[PDB]
Design a protein around this ligand. Structure first.
Ligand SMILES: [Mg+2]
Ligand SMILES: [Mg+2]
Ligand SMILES: [Mg+2]
Ligand SMILES: [Mg+2]
Ligand SMILES: [Mg+2]
Ligand SMILES: [Mg+2]
Lengths: 308, 308, 308, 308, 308, 308
């Protein structure tokens, strides 16, 4: 039937997913040389089977990517009937346009590599730009964390009915307006010009900074100040993907957030030990559910407006 | 080396403008439309071994225009043109560039694929609805900007421009307007139709310039104008790079409060201007001419991105 | 299992087909802008399913083609397991060679577009040139109207046993000789040189002009005269595809045909109201049968010599 | 720039004729045949950065010839030739260009695909069995005509040519013969083997010229000749562009009533002519030379289509 | 379900395989012209079916290859759901590198042709270089004769426990060392410098020359002498593929072999009548078993270390 | 015409050496590494219409190096470089070039595919682990040899070289060492780790030169050296073209009996040499420079294969 494999040493999300599906993760024999040259050997037959490979959260993005590509390749030439890549946080997603530079569109290159490696289907969560689906010719299911975020908001913020959803940048409006309209509240936008400007009403309201991902957190931390200076009562930040590299964890601990909420598309345990503002939404059920439905020719649309 | 430039359809205004600036006559193409509007095209001269540029027409009917373009590209390729560049000022189906939570086609990717399979080696276009659309191709795309021309026109036609506001008609236009606002060094603001219009940012007692990449039926831009007046804007202008202007069309602009409505001639505006005094056109033929010339010669087209 | 969708507002043939299969046409949400820019949204899940899309007979060939391409694309990126295009009258089929001109081979371009859009299989009727199957790399089933034509002939023409099958042009010999041999009668050929020449025996025989398609009908009408001048008793014309654009319907009403017979690969109702010489063979059963057999891994060869 | 011309096999007559007209020596290629007639090829000189033309051999054995051609194209491509054109006077498997109501391969499409994947950038050929075969490629194909040469030979060798008939041996040859007949301004007629031969059109007391694109065993052309005499033709000639001439071969032509049998040297005829006085050859090396020269130089090869 | 067809007139191995599977070989209608131009027509429907085509051992390698390619193509455009090529001896396998020459890599070209013809899976035995799997992007199962060879050795050579496995060339070490280690014996290597040198211990031991294929047998015959001159007690040669072209059969009959063992990947009956040193290992069961397992999504790994 | 040469990473030693020999400065590329070591690259100058050579870095981390290379190739392609050649002295994942009886990836094929899809038009490399790897590409690959340089160094540094033995550390290195041994006109021998080391061929009282294409942890080469001494070799040298030298690394070489250990600078050796007196480097920058120069100019790079 279905076989789930995990990208690498991070079984953490893949193990949660396989559990929810009533499955054990398939056997994979890994060997890493010094140059980090990745070795893989699929430890069981996948001949004739529909395979799902869940990319690791091991950290080193180029290592994780190659490993995934290599396992996809190994499964394909081992006669897997189909191979689906489950990539909760899509690598190089922020590199999806030229922006008036002689820049690679590396998210396209990544889509191309996944295709030539032999992927038949992609399942991801909150593509940084939804245009990235168009970077492929194979089907992509781009799951939303929105239902889970709206639920977390209604359950953890007393004042959600009078709050303002804030975008930390110009290109995040659509996302926050969509959330503001669902909750039926206000929205506001920050724009960095080196000075931030705020448009929209946050005074004496709870402010919720919503974004797809936080990396170094320079931006969100500064946005929280700005929001407080403009009269917000308190500030939350909710990111789908919690990268938190560099001084993020330090920037967060010193920042005036009530809480910083992220999904577990990227593993957060280590990060949480050193940062108590962080709360995690488990998205394994959504991913597990999408895999389940996909395999069964069932509908996945359900998951865009609802949490399993 | 030598190049050849052909025009799609019998919109030859842009095409003929372009060929003039380059010191070329438009190539000979013989065009009959059969029965069901089945498109016939025949290249009236040899293109063997030549670098061909086909400038997409402006015959309004988007599927006719697109098929004629594809058929010309094809006819040239199998006639042993050494290279074929499609020049497409207004990229068809550009608005259809994501699923947006629906079982929708990503038609702009279909179009990129069709141009590619038709044999296009290179694409020149202006103000792609989303920059990620370049990523829909594996061939090089040059995405020209009207921005410099617009900035120039704003400074040379709006006296109170130094304290004006640049306004986006919707949430998704944020990035466009903030880039302009930042360059003029003025304020920006955004409108959102709640799913009544809401305006965030200030416009009271200042000229408001609605800026958008394209306007079709103008229902959105014309509402925004009212709200902008309701909000206390002195005068409201509307600036679109692509003036599709159909249906309720020029009706709405007249019965609307725009001081002026500026567009480029990426789409033919001659007829529309007859029934609309408040419409003005920035000629972009020079930019496209210059992009073609430079492209062919190996010089930096990128400079055009910031200058006129 | 199987899902049938119709290209557009013409459900007329697609509805006949779905009926014969015991099915309702799937839900499709269509929106058309002014520029005729086609919008589609598949109104139900097609995930995991074998989809058949039947191209419209809405008239505007480039509109119908793009619409089809767009629905194919939408179904594919919605994870349809397979998508088959049912294209009773193949667009641009008459543009299938260069013919000593710098001409596109647009039927190849059309095959390429259908392929890149994501079609896995084509089902068509009477390709204008059977070489067009070679324009694809995917499987094509090219159904023949011949069995249905031979049946109509045996049942509507008393004198069929002593009739002559006439080709209106040089490149139609094979088709008519094949029909003449099946019926065991004579065949004859018209060739336009601006004068028509007839070779073959039609004197005191019923003459049946057989062709794949009639468009403006200039040719067939003139052939009927010629046949009568050469002594044919009466003349019928039988075309698989009844385009009948331009002055066809006028040319037919003034022409000396006993009857003009066409299939419903193209809708004929409107055309018949204004032309009483026209009779229609329903080919929905054949198409319905091919779809049924294809889906079931059954044999379709049956249909080439026999009417379901 | 410079080009290099290589010959397939040790048929070097056409190849060497061609290279002469171009002032070139044939490139050095080392060729051993192993065991199972496994083909070995080695390019005896650098082709790096060069425009290569490989002229397909005439070693009779069609699969050996085709593999040798593919292997040469490949060897040149991976040796960094900048461009490779296959010159194939007689396109192999051209008769296998449709299914014709059978579970048959479309082998001419297979061949086009194999040439393409072998790395051919361009094809030059003469009298494709069907013009649609150009459509089997995505690369440019130039399909040269023997027609002008044939027309010239007919006028210069048949005294009663002004009142002669051009006759097709079968139904599918109609278009070929009517094009010739129309240019000579004479009569045409067609033969059909009923599925006994039937002749339509007149030939009594006039010279009849059987014209075909190719003759293999000559069973069809030789029967047609009898019937043509039975019908009262004065003298019968046979004119084929491709003289495959195998098996019953030249036997049949001798014991047949042909005044003459004309062919081109797209296939080597030297040996065949030994055992056949009535055979004559139009040399086509000049046309191919001229097509190559012009191709390389960017001039109009199309003129060759009508002239010699 | 599954359908087996045979490449050509050699049903000999294909018939053995179909028997072992409980199947009759599918019907194929073949016609060969003089030029050996191959004609095929699949004599039954393959629509929706998983097809296996077993390449012939008819002798003429280019004929066999084209025939296979043509049947693959015919099956694909006849809507076979899948087509697997069973190619016991992979053609042009010895042409898999440039080797400091301007040589084709013809095994890659062969892989490319098989791919464009429409093969979804390859099943072969003992690729001359296992890198050849990488020449494809589709799955390849490369079966080993090793288990069958080790079994033949243990059962036919009393002294196998004290024998030496010898490679006839430098590039055969891995193969023989692998066999020597399994049997737990010595290995030795011949290297041609025009003089052969032997490294390794063969004195007073039985010597077993093991290789993937023998063609003209010049090398193996000379190696046997060398081995005897160095003190081997007697010499066997075991090749997976017995080509035995040219003077092989004469070279073998005059050579000092105890026996020459080959599989029936290539038919040996005729060859054996004229050479009594030859013994044949039947590998039909292995191939039959791989087909059986593949179709059933079962594991094939079994067969690499074990004989069915 | 002009070319441009860029370097991967901040290993610029080889790159800068190469550009010197060519009289060029390295192109301007701006490189930041984000968070997860996500690679940012920006071409600091126009490459429009230029022939670009990107020299892969030596930053050790193989997946970082490979992604940076792919991203540069991509950035150049979409910036309208007319041609992009990847220069990759040490081909990553080259050891992963077959399955070897496992459900293993063929990662070197994945890599070839990724380079191809990234847009590489041509590959220049040195000493491919297996020559068949060229077959993994459809684009031209030039595989340079260190052999001439090694042969030169052996003759100029080993006094007793005329009666020395060339030794392979394993069974698969046979062909490499016999080619060298044959050219020096000396003895060869081979080592095999029984699956204890076995040595076949003689080395007693003669200098033994271990030759390999690459050494990683040196466990194999360092054991072989012991056995070589145990066997009675006078002095043992080790010669690898690719000195990866990781982990137990230079430790082992020091505590091993090598007179010297020679490597090329396909990989940076500066740091390694600090902790290893017995290491020496043959500079190969001249070969690569010369291959690039000649490649660009259309001259025979093949001469480099045999000479220095
Ligand atoms: Mg699945
Ligand atoms: Mg150009
Ligand atoms: Mg189906
Ligand atoms: Mg050329
Ligand atoms: Mg199967
Ligand atoms: Mg170059």
């Amino acid at each position: 039937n279905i076989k789930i494999f995990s990208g690498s040493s991070h079984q953490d999300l893949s193990q949660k997913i396989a559990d929810r599906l009533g499955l054990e993760l398939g056997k994979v024999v890994t060997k890493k040389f010094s140059n980090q040259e990745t070795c893989v050997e699929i430890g069981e037959s996948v001949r004739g089977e529909h395979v799902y490979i869940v990319q690791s959260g091991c950290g080193e993005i180029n290592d994780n990517l190659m490993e995934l590509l290599i396992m996809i390749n190994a499964c394909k030439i081992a006669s897997a009937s189909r191979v689906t890549a489950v990539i909760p946080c899509f690598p190089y997603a922020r590199q999806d346009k030229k922006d008036k530079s002689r820049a690679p569109i590396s998210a396209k290159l990544v889509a191309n590599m996944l295709s030539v490696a032999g992927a038949d289907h992609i399942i991801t969560m909150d593509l940084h730009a939804s245009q990235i689906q168009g970077f492929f010719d194979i089907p992509v299911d781009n799951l939303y964390a929105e239902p889970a975020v709206l639920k977390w908001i209604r359950e953890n913020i007393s004042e959600w009915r009078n709050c303002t959803i804030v975008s930390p940048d110009a290109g995040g409006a659509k996302r926050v307006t969509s959330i503001a309209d669902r909750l039926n509240v206000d929205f506001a936008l920050i724009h960095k010009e080196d000075r931030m400007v705020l448009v929209g009403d946050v005074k004496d309201r709870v402010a919720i900074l919503v974004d797809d991902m936080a990396d170094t957190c320079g931006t969100i931390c500064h946005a929280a100040d700005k929001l407080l200076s403009a009269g917000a009562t308190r500030v939350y930040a909710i990111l789908t993907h919690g990268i938190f590299s560099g001084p993020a964890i330090s920037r967060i601990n010193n920042a005036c957030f009530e809480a910083v909420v992220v999904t577990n598309t990227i593993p957060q345990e280590d990060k949480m030990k050193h940062c108590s503002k962080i709360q995690v939404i488990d998205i394994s059920m959504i991913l597990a559910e999408a895999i389940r439905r996909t395999h069964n020719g069932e509908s996945v649309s359900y998951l865009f407006s609802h949490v399993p």
